[PDB]
Amino acid sequence: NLYFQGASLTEIEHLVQSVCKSYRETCQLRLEDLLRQRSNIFSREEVTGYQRKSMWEMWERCAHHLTEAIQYVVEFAKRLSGFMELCQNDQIVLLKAGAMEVVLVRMCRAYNADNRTVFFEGKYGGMELFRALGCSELISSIFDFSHSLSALHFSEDEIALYTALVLINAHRPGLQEKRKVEQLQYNLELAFHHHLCKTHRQSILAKLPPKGKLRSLCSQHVERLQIFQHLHPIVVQAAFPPLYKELFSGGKILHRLLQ
Numbered sequence: 091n092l093y094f095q096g097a098s099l100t101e102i103e104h105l106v107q108s109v110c111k112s113y114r115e116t117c118q119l120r121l122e123d124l125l126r127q128r129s130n131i132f133s134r135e136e137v138t139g140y141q142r143k144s145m146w147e148m149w150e151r152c153a154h155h156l157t158e159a160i161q162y163v164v165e166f167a168k169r170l171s172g173f174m175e176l177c178q179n180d181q182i183v184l185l186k187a188g189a190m191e192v193v194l195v196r197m198c199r200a201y202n203a204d205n206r207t208v209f210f211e212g213k214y215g216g217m218e219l220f221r222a223l224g225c226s227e228l229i230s231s232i233f234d235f236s237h238s239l240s241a242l243h244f245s246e247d248e249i250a251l252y253t254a255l256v257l258i259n260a261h262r263p264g265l266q267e268k269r270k271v272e273q274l275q276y277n278l279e280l281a282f283h284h285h286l287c288k289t290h291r292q293s294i295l296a297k298l299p300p301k302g303k304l305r306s307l308c309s310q311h312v313e314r315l316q317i318f319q320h321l322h323p324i325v326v327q328a329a330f331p332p333l334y335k336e337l338f339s340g341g342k343i344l345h346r347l348l349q
């Protein structure tokens with residue numbers, strides 16, 4: 091929109107409010123409900139039930155909860171200034187490469203660093219809950235990532251502006267209108283940095299996760315998905331969500347959602 095060109099301070103400050111609004115309207119669960127349900131945690135019997143579940147059933151349940159989270163990320167993008175003004179090829183390029191990374195950041199709200207548990211299917215559970223997945227190295231890496239993010243003590247507004255920058259990334263391979271994405275990213279970084287300056291919160295800039303860790307977590311996920319697909323190809327074909335397979339398994343629901 092406007093933010094495909096240079097922006098004044100006043101336009102930057104209103105971009106802050108716009109992004110913070112779009113995130114408030116499109117976050118799956120409210121922070122207050124997540125924090126308040128930390129007292130209810132899975133029993134040792136319930137954890138065993140999850141661990142004794144079959145691998146392909148666990149993978150399918152997790153793929154559906156992941157797809158649900160992606161759907162709110164897509165709606166977040168559609169409410170972001172300039173995203174719908176972009177061409178549809180670039181919209182799909184940004185979502186295909188960022189929607190998972192955004193979910194990985196949003197996840198720190200559902201994570202409790204006090205006991206290293208995460209809110210999953212109604213209760214809080216540690217990473218042993220997912221032992222039936224057979225990717226304990228990836229699970230551990232994601233729990234560590236949420237742990238380091240929780241150390242930053244994000245506000246909701248900070249998560250809003252950070253995840254906006256995760257999505258609007260002009261370096262994604264395949265962008266057709268790169269410079270126009272470059273300007274949108276530039277204005278969104280001013281909005282982010284303006285908010286941190288105003289709230290005396292710039293010290294977190296040097297504490298943010300490095301660029302290659304969100305990309306590395308996403309690669310590990312595609313890595314483990316291909317290993318699961320080789321072991322259970324009909325499960326993926328018959329029971330995985332279409333949006334999930336479009337994003338992480340090559341071969342169009344994004345087209346529909348974007349319109």
Ligand SMILES: C=C(C)[C@@H]1CC[C@]2(C(=O)O)CC[C@]3(C)[C@H](CC[C@@H]4[C@@]5(C)CC[C@H](O)C(C)(C)[C@@H]5CC[C@]43C)[C@@H]12
Binds near residue numbers: 200
């Ligand atoms: C089985 C697969 C499709 C994924 C492959 C391994 C995996 C990965 O993505 O790396 C390991 C992390 C998990 C288990 C994903 C599946 C989605 C979930 C989920 C967002 C679901 C909704 C929940 O409320 C909560 C926010 C707590 C989790 C956080 C943990 C991950 C990201 C799996």
